[PDB]
Write a protein that binds this DNA or RNA. Structure first.
Lengths: 107, 333, 335, 336, 336, 108
DNA sequence: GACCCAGT
DNA sequence: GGGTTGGGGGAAGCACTGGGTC
């Protein structure tokens, strides 16, 4: 479903074990409707990789795994023909929904 | 086939009186029974004699009196005494009628008196009706004891209620399931499990009981009853008895449907169970204003509701389990 | 005279028809349901709608405001100026005017003449009967299902918190025993595109319903039991009462919300005699249906004048291009 | 004397109207869904907005400041001078006057005869039971439709993290349990061609709701409780309370945000009588609407005073080309 | 006594107000979205800007620095002397006086009497609930609209990459395996013709907000909890705090910052009565708006003094030609 | 279609570790741009650091980075002229910058 | 139309 | 890049006209 392997990275910026607490990207991706801000919002989340990489090592747990590019194109190839907001929100909301998880990997 | 006749007075009162017929025939057997819906008549079709009907009532009222006398003119703290009862004048008048049948039903004598129905069993009651010009005195709606006793027995066991007082004020929310196309003994008996006996929460930490649409979720959360609604069809009817500042009046009365809420919780609590209740309880206790956005998204399939509640609740405290997130997308896909 | 206004309204972020606040802290806004036809089926949505009681109350409010302009402001009840709207009672026979005059309840002839508020919205007196039907009727303000067809979702309910700061004798904050009034509550405002429809019955102003005609010279004429010159003034006092509607004076919380109000499209019919209402601003087929109803009334012998605002409404009808409610009123006040 | 002001404002860089709590990180800004076209149907789009409560509170703040200079400034609530909008809350049966006196709670007129706060923004008397309708009505602050149509809603929200430097006396910031209340909080700021439609009703000042008229010789005369000079001074102060509205005192957090402002197209109508409200600036095509609301309403017999800025109108009415709002209210206080 | 300062300045490659990298090396600067007029239509663009928190912190630093000069600098805050801007973080009930004493947080008047910085900058005491809004309002720092129109942004970022050198006795850079420090991080700097606007409310120093006036004889008389000489000294310190606000002590990056930051044009008004705030420099048409707001205000009989630079504001305005920045507050302080 | 992954692989070598090269400025400017003109400017700034990275990877033991094929340059050039409206320009402006952060096996 | 009442 | 802080506590509807009996 190319979702379980990308939602855990989105969850890295909300969990208490990583105290940076940037909800602006989650708000931007949750309210993405027409064609562009959905791809722009996920950029902000995927950019803050160093943050998590340093923060996991600052406590002791292994560095977080960055999502593989084997399935990133599944969003670009799907957003094209799904131009209307009828079914585009149907997955845009799930993208932000998967960002609010725990994924306890840093005990 | 007997087909016990059921008088038609109010769409909600008739629901309570007719839907409470089963609690007595179960005590008397009545194998191979059914309840044909009529929207408001809701007639019971059973091939049983009338004699055992009173044998059911005497056992039911024995249970009621055992519950009433146990707790404490004497006023108890039960559903039929002070739980859902908002008026104090009915705190002792209602039980007095209930024990009165002990002098009428035990020796096989029909009812001859006629009492006054309170507002709790039927919200359309009151004091000031309109007929042609102006109002009148007292309560013109007067219910015979036969139909009067048949309502409380179905009210106490089957329909649940939630009470949240907070000192002088008092909020009472009453919910009941009404069949609309077909129903059998499998569903009506299962609906009995939803009843919350002694739902007196008070304190201040349990404030999430604000609003009826939010209290229904909390009532439903801790009752993993039968999930037959995924193949059946049922409707939820709810009404409130507000007593803000000792002012007994109804300020909220809406009609919703319970099937989609059944499906939502059934599809949510499937991947895991330990964390789902913790998550929903945390969002309800902490995100008081945010859980409204979650409940509202259920009867209309609102996508933004599934996110706004989580956004508003995560800021205070949320476990945010992994297996429950995949449960939401099962409904979404 | 006989005016039927209707159309669609685009107002958003407004607190209308709240739940009070006697003890409930979260003041959730009223929520309604509407059905819409799509994908060969019917679906409902939890969308708010505003009752027309707000519209009627604001009509009552504007009636006295436009009635105090003319020097005929004497004939008005005291309770009308305080926005009471009780209209006597089961035993109240005397009236309280601005000057304190006493009115005896015997018939509408001696009531609609000395009092003007009791005629537009009617009254009742269970002691002696003599009920008066409301001459002005409002309609519920509900969102059209075209907006649902193009949305069929979204929150469309803006929940904002509001705080009431409080100070002690020196600036302290109490919790439950210091005698403070600090409060933190919520307010939900409604959005979307709604519809409006208002009917006015100015032909019964000053004419009792029991005896609408004189009928003593073999010539049926209106039974104006009041003075015609002030009757004409009373016409405008109720005709201009709908002007504040088209400006934003709808519902409550006007001091804190003041709905963002602007009508996008409307249709009205004005006539000397009774005429049917066109359509509520709800259904998508609210233009062409009106295009039918007009030809359903012209063949019956009705001198109906159609006023259109941001709608073509075809070309055969002799409609007037209206750009605001005010010139519609200005074109109606003449007759 | 009812006056309607409506127009635009290039209000930006403001953390106004923020939803956050003590135990709530990431204090975020209010967002109101609105209905637009975007060369298609009446779609819904998210956009930050501002509540009219705020505007009412800041109107109160400006009104008390401008009423201090008045010679009758002693006739005001003490709590009003404390920049508090708690007009007769819960917990007290009476308020406190500025000089230290109290106010009695049976008659409505005697409440406002020595107090200028309930006579300008209303009040509520829980224990007593009586109430008063509000004077000034403030509308929400929403951007222009075309502004969000052209940009099709590209975020339009800027989240900035802020922190403090609460370092101990020794000169070290170690653990939370150490005693250093120092942390990272985020503030949201917005921009847009916002609009406002404030309205004031100065014909009801000093007029109790219970007894608005007297009619001692059966003549049109509203029942005024205060001196006519006092009423004129109060009306002038209320009108002067409009300058801070465009002067940057729109909302709170001015110590850290202080949004940028500019006088855009404005329209003000006032003729000392019952006047309909104006059209809000949230809709892009509202200017032409203003060319029809007052075009024939002047011919209805009303001496409508229109003051306009940054708009040519239909060059057919007596629309005064006012420079700024202070001259606008100067032209209003000279006709009362 | 109220003061409004505004105008247009020019900044060149400053790293003021950055989020705070973290592990990340590009130290991203605060980006704010603002409106642009454009001959086509109103659009929005993101530009690097400076929040008001900074301006307020630097104003507080200047205030305490110039208050140390006054002989009455003993009544101060130990946190203020340590250049700390936090106000009573949660964890302690009382506070410590700069003299070394203990300040009881039970009376606002005592707090403002013994704490000069908190009197003008407000404070926050959640433990006892003591609140006081700051007398200074600081806006953001944004490039003007015409500047963005004539430059089109062009991503307006200057990124320079630096390293950290960790040379021990052995003289080895290491490979982050022994405990060395050899990494590569980047800092960016921003330029542009920005604007400034600050509001001073120097009429509440020495006067608690709870009890502004006494009204002992039904006459306007503010009640001051301190001797008038201390109030005058505090006013002088507040006025002198604005002199470094245009000198270069603005922002952060005290190791690489301090760009040119010289004022190109400034406008100011000062009057003991309530006066509006001038338009923050963001637009190409604010000059005539300020001209109107300073011309029509004088017609209302307001004793207001206007100072201006660069722009003479026509010949009808009697505003003097203030050149430097200290002479403005100096001429303001001789006129008390 | 097809060239996005190839250009994203090249952009990945600028933000990953084991290279001692961290330049986020250009990748930030490519994505959150406003006008079509600066898109190609950011592309040039990102692409310029080809020779300095094509030689250090093998010195550090990593495999050399695969330079994007010149055919993809034709596609990225010919995609932007006909698409001038900003409505669907930001999506392609951020599409290539998205693939900068991924799990590419730069240094196995 | 004047009476009635509650528990953490 | 390498560490310190993620809210902090306080508030989170009063009064107000109660609706039944008898």
């Amino acid at each position: 479903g190319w979702i379980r392997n990308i939602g855990r990275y989105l969850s890295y910026l909300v969990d208490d074990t990583f105290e940076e607490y940037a909800y602006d990207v989650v708000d931007g991706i949750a309210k993405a409707r027409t064609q562009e801000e959905l791809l722009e919002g996920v950029y902000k989340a995927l950019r803050l990789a160093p943050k998590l990489k340093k923060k996991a090592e600052s406590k002791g747990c292994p560095p977080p795994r960055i999502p593989s590019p084997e399935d990133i194109e599944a969003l670009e190839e799907k957003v094209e023909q799904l131009s209307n907001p009828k079914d585009l929100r149907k997955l845009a909301v799930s993208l932000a929904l998967w960002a609010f998880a725990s994924w306890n990997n840093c005990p | 086939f007997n087909e016990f006749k059921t008088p038609q007075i109010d769409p909600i009162f008739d629901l309570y009186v007719a839907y409470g017929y089963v609690v007595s025939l179960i005590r008397g057997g009545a194998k191979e029974a059914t309840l044909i819906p009529h929207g408001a008549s809701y007639l019971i079709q059973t091939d049983v004699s009338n004699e055992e009907f009173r044998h059911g009532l005497v056992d039911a009222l024995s249970s009621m009196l055992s519950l009433h006398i146990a707790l404490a003119k004497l006023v108890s703290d039960a559903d039929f005494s002070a739980g859902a009862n908002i008026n104090n004048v009915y705190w002792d008048s209602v039980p007095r009628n209930l024990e009165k049948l002990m002098k009428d039903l035990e020796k096989k004598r029909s009812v001859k008196g006629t009492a006054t129905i309170p507002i709790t069993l039927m919200p359309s009651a009151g004091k000031y009706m309109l007929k042609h010009f102006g109002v009148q005195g007292g309560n013109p709606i007067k219910v015979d004891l036969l139909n009067y006793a048949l309502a409380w027995v179905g009210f106490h066991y089957y329909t649940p209620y939630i009470k949240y007082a907070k000192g002088d004020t008092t909020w009472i929310h009453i919910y009941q399931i009404a069949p609309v196309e077909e129903v059998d003994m499998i569903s009506i008996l299962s609906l009995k499990d939803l009843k919350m006996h002694l739902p007196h929460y008070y304190e201040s930490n349990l404030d999430f009981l604000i609003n009826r649409r939010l209290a229904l979720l909390y009532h439903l959360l801790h009752s993993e009853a039968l999930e037959l609604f995924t193949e059946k069809e049922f409707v939820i009817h709810s009404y409130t008895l507000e007593r803000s500042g000792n002012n007994q009046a109804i300020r909220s009365f809406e009609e919703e449907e319970i099937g989609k809420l059944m499906d939502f919780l059934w599809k949510l609590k499937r991947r895991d169970f330990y964390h789902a209740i913790k998550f929903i309880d945390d969002l309800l206790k902490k995100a008081t204003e945010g859980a409204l956005a979650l409940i509202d998204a259920i009867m209309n399939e609102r996508l933004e509701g599934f996110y706004t509640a989580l956004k508003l609740g995560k800021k205070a405290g949320v476990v945010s389990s992994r297996e429950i997130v995949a449960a939401l997308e099962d409904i979404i896909c | 005279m006989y005016v039927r206004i209707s159309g669609r309204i685009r107002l958003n972020a407004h607190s209308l028809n709240a739940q009070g606040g006697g003890g409930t802290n979260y003041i959730e806004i009223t929520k309604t349901k509407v059905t819409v036809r799509t994908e060969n089926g019917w679906t409902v949505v939890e969308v708010p709608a505003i009752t027309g009681n707000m519209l009627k109350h604001w009509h009552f409010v504007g009636f006295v405001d436009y009635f105090k302009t003319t020097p005929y402001g004497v004939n008005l009840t005291e309770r009308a100026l305080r926005y009471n709207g009780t209209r006597f009672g089961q035993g109240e026979t005397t009236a309280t005017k601005a000057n304190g005059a006493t009115v005896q309840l015997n018939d509408e002839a001696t009531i609609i003449k000395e009092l003007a508020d009791a005629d537009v919205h009617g009254f009742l007196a269970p002691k002696t009967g003599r009920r008066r039907v409301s001459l002005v009727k409002a309609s519920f303000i509900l969102p059209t299902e075209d907006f649902i067809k193009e949305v069929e979702g979204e929150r469309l309910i803006t929940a904002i918190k509001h705080n009431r700061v409080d100070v002690d004798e020196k600036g302290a904050i109490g919790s439950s025993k210091e005698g403070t009034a600090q409060m933190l509550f919520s307010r939900e405002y409604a959005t979307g595109l709604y519809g409006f429809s208002i009917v006015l019955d100015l032909g019964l102003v000053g004419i009792p319903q029991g005896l609408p005609v004189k009928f003593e010279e073999n010539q049926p004429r209106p039974n104006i039991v009041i003075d015609p010159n002030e009757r004409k003034a009373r016409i405008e006092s109720a005709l201009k009462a709908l002007i504040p509607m088209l400006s934003g004076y709808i519902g409550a919380n006007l001091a804190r919300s003041f709905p963002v109000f602007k009508v996008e499209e409307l249709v009205a019919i004005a006539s000397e005699g009774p005429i049917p209402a066109l359509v509520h601003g709800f259904y998508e087929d609210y233009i062409e249906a009106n295009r039918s109803i007009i030809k359903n009334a012209r063949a019956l012998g009705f001198n109906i004048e159609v006023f259109t605002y941001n709608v073509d409404l075809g070309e055969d009808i002799e409609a007037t291009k209206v750009s605001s409610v005010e010139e519609l009123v200005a074109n109606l006040v003449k007759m």
